[PDB]
Structure formats: structure tokens, C-alpha cells
Design a protein around this ligand. Structure first.
Ligand code: APR
Lengths: 89, 89
């Protein structure tokens, strides 16, 4: 799975927690980064939704092999192709 | 230390002139009634006064020349007359 940086809500909150160690995720940090990007519906979040999304983001960023960020390099803004090839390999 | 002016000035007496500064605090709710949120912390509301020739908002705090009605010395005309003693209780 390749995520694209500078795109939207869920993309940015996955792309920020890419290179982080797996134990360094705090459930406080999740809702902190969540409510700024979800600032339209940030107040619509409950604690059970926060712990579910924290568990899911944890179990995703564990498997570091199967994920890549596009990084939105934005100096050439080359293609999706350069990302998709490394995410294949 | 030193201030640069000898004397009493516009103060009542020498040494300290004792006064009480009360503050009222409450939370700031959204349209739903939940607490509005900052980046991390929350939003707070204080009740302030503006005098006609002060051009400034300030705390309703009075000189502690009377004992218990020093908030009333700030807020007899501001708060109430009889219910003011109840809120002072
Ligand atoms: N900590 C302070 N910070 C800033 N200004 C101050 C402070 N303390 C006093 N002042 C200013 O000094 C001036 C004289 O002080 P007092 O008159 O003793 O203060 P107070 O009794 O709280 O204010 C009386 C108010 O009634 C009006 O007639 C007059 O305009 C004044 O605003 C006031 O205009 C007040 O704004």
C-alpha cells in the first residue's frame, strides 16, 4: 500500500507516523494528530473510536515491509510510477 | 528594590495596601454543549468589566479595606445587593 503525502485527512495522519517506532504511538498522540486534520468533525470523536483507530494504525505500521509513503517530493512531482515500482520491489 | 519615586503616591497608606482580586472561571462550550478544544488544551471563559473611563477590561477586584464586602467594593453596583451577599457566601 502506497499512501500519498499532502493529500487529505487520513493520508497525512498515516504519513506522519511512518518512520516512528511502533511503541512510540500514544493514544494521546493519535487523537492529537487526529483532531487537527479532522477539524471539521474533530468534536464528533469518542474514546472508543480513538482506541479503535489507534489499534488499527498500530497494526498497520507494525508491518513496515508492506507500506510506503509517496512523500510528495514536490520538486519534480515525478509520477506515481516511481513510488509504485519501489512498493513492488 | 528601588522604584525612583519617594512618597505615598495615590495609594491609601504606606507599606502594602491590601486588596483581594477574585476571578471567576468557566468552560467554553460548543453548539452541542461539549467543551470546545484548542490544539491540546481547552477553552476558558472569565467574566470581566469595562468601566466608561478606563478604556480597558479588568478583573472585578476590590481593595480589602472592608472585610468581606471587598468583592462588593468591587461589585456592589456590579453584581447585586442581597444576592451579592449570598454569592459572597
Ligand atoms: N495594575 C494596573 N494596571 C493598569 N492600570 C492600572 C493598574 N492599577 C491602576 N491602574 C490605573 O490607574 C488609574 C487610577 O487608579 P484607581 O482610580 O485607583 O483605579 P480604580 O479605582 O480601579 O479605577 C477607577 C476608575 O474609575 C474611573 O473614574 C477611572 O477612569 C478609573 O478607570 C486607573 O485609571 C487605572 O486604570
Amino acid at each position: 500500500c502506497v499512501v500519498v503525502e499532502g493529500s487529505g485527512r487520513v493520508a497525512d495522519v498515516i504519513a506522519q507516523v511512518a518512520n516512528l517506532p511502533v511503541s512510540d504511538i500514544t493514544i494521546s498522540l493519535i487523537q492529537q494528530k487526529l483532531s487537527v486534520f479532522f477539524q471539521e468533525m474533530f468534536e464528533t470523536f469518542t474514546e472508543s473510536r480513538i482506541v479503535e483507530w489507534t489499534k488499527k494504525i498500530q497494526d498497520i505500521v507494525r508491518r513496515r515491509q508492506l507500506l510506503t509513503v509517496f512523500r510528495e517530493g514536490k520538486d519534480g512531482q515525478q509520477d506515481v510510477d516511481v513510488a509504485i515500482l519501489q512498493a513492488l520491489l | 528594590g528601588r522604584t525612583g519615586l519617594r512618597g505615598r503616591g495615590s495609594l491609601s497608606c504606606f507599606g502594602p495596601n491590601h486588596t483581594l482580586y477574585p476571578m471567576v472561571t468557566r468552560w467554553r462550550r460548543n453548539e452541542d454543549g461539549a467543551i470546545c478544544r484548542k490544539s491540546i488544551k481547552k477553552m476558558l471563559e472569565v467574566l470581566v468589566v469595562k468601566l466608561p473611563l478606563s478604556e480597558h477590561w479588568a478583573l472585578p477586584g476590590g481593595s480589602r479595606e472592608p472585610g468581606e464586602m471587598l468583592p462588593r467594593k468591587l461589585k456592589r453596583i456590579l453584581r447585586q445587593e442581597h444576592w451579592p451577599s449570598f454569592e459572597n457566601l
